Each structure stands twice: as C-alpha cells, then as structure tokens.
Design a protein around this nucleic acid. Structure first.
Lengths: 49, 99
DNA sequence: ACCGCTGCAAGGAATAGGATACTTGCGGGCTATATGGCGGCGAATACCC
RNA sequence: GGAGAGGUA
DNA sequence: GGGTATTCGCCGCGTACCTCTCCTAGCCCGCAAGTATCCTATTCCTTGCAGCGGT
C-alpha cells in the first residue's frame, strides 16, 4: 500500500490536473514528459535534447 | 501455502492450505481518465525515456584535446546493472559497471 | 425400656438462565542500492628520464 | 518551516 | 630526484511573483468489546439416619 500510494499521491509524474477548460484537460492528459525517475533533470539538460 | 515432507524425497505433499489474503489498495480510474486521490483528482502524464537495449555512442572529440574520437558501447537493461565498454586514448578497451 | 415405624435429609435421572472466564482487533504510545551536465582548475599521482 | 509540481514577466 | 602528462575531485551555473499538494516506520502494550463456558436454579426417582408412638 505504501509503495503504490506514495507513487500515485506524490511523485513527479502524478500531477494536479488544471481544469479550467475542456481543452486544458484534453491537452494535459496527452502530455509526454521527459522528466521524472529515470529521465533527465530539468536544469542540467543540454541543448541537443 | 504448500508443505512438503522432509524425510520423503524432494517432491511430495503432506498437506496444502490456502486462503484469500488481503493486500493493498490500487486506485481506480474514472471514466474520463483522471484518478481521484484525496478529493483532488489528478492525472498521470506519460514518460519518454530511453529504451533498453544497446547503443554504440561516441564523443565528438571533446576529450584528450587531440582531435581523436572515442567510441563507446553501452548495454542498458530494463532492470538491473548497466554495462559499458570504452576506448582509452591509447586504444585500450575498458569495461565499466554502474559507473 | 426396647422396637419397628414415620419422617426428614443425601444422592441419582430431566429442563431454563445469568456469571464470568476467555479471545480478539485496535489505537495510541513509543523508538530508530544509481547509472541523460559541462567547464575550469588545482592538487595529487604517473611516468620515464 | 521544508520539499515536489505547474504557471506569469 | 625532476620535469612532465594524466587523472580526480571540487566549484559554479538569473530575478521576482502566483497556484496546488505532502511532511517517518514499525513494534507493542494497554485496552474495549464480544463471546463460549461454567455454575445456578427448578422438576422426578431411590437411599440412610434420627425422632417417636406404643407397648
């Protein structure tokens, strides 16, 4: 329970859903992030990426 | 749970017992595609991470100041310890494990 | 002035009913193993004289 | 008070 | 020893503001609640001893 709940509730890829439109929801559910566990850090990523 | 018999050869059953053990609570997904965690429905975005396999990468001559490239080959598993092979400027061959 | 009698307790078979020892899940109270960043630079070895 | 995420110039 | 090359490890990477969420893990011991059990009565029967009229 801890191992799943901690991921779902507080991770870098389970984020609060801005909901001030239909469009915001649709375009937020299709997002394709590159950060998170196993990805590349925000502030030390080169330019070629 | 299954219990063998010690004196009997490997493979035998003295008695076997089972029951329906509870474990965990997996959140479910609403119809739209948004989970509800604590009255604060959230969404999980997809990730774009580099795939497991093998990559023969190289550095574009940014070491040794000699203009000599240095090819390297990495094996990236899905879960475990990585593996790297590299070429020293002296044309050696060096393994490297988990950096 | 002796005795067999009646009668009055002590221990067996059938039902209802509370007390009370026993069992259990908790709630708060406490203690104690990573792998996508370069660049500069200076110190610390390596090296082959 | 500290972390994580998103946003504006 | 000594001049030199190569490697290792430390230091550094913009300002101001707004919104949201979440903040240690595990054992343990008292303790409330709920229960199965044990002792408590009633009705029938057949004994064993002490009074007791009677002569």
């Amino acid at each position: 329970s801890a191992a799943v709940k901690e991921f779902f509730g507080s991770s870098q890829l389970s984020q609060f859903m801005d909901q001030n439109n239909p469009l915001s929801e649709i375009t937020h559910k299709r997002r394709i992030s590159a950060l998170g566990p196993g990805g590349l850090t925000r502030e030390r990523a080169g330019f070629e990426v | 749970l299954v219990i063998y018999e010690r004196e009997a050869p490997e493979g035998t059953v003295k008695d076997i017992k089972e029951q329906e053990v509870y474990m965990g609570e997996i959140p479910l997904m609403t119809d739209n595609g948004t989970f509800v965690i604590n009255g604060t429905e959230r969404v999980i975005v997809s990730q774009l991470h580099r795939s497991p396999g093998v990559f023969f990468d190289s550095d574009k001559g940014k070491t040794h100041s000699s203009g000599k490239v240095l090819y390297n080959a990495r094996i990236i598993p899905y879960r475990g310890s990585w593996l790297d092979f590299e070429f020293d400027p002296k044309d050696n061959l060096f393994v490297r494990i988990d950096r």
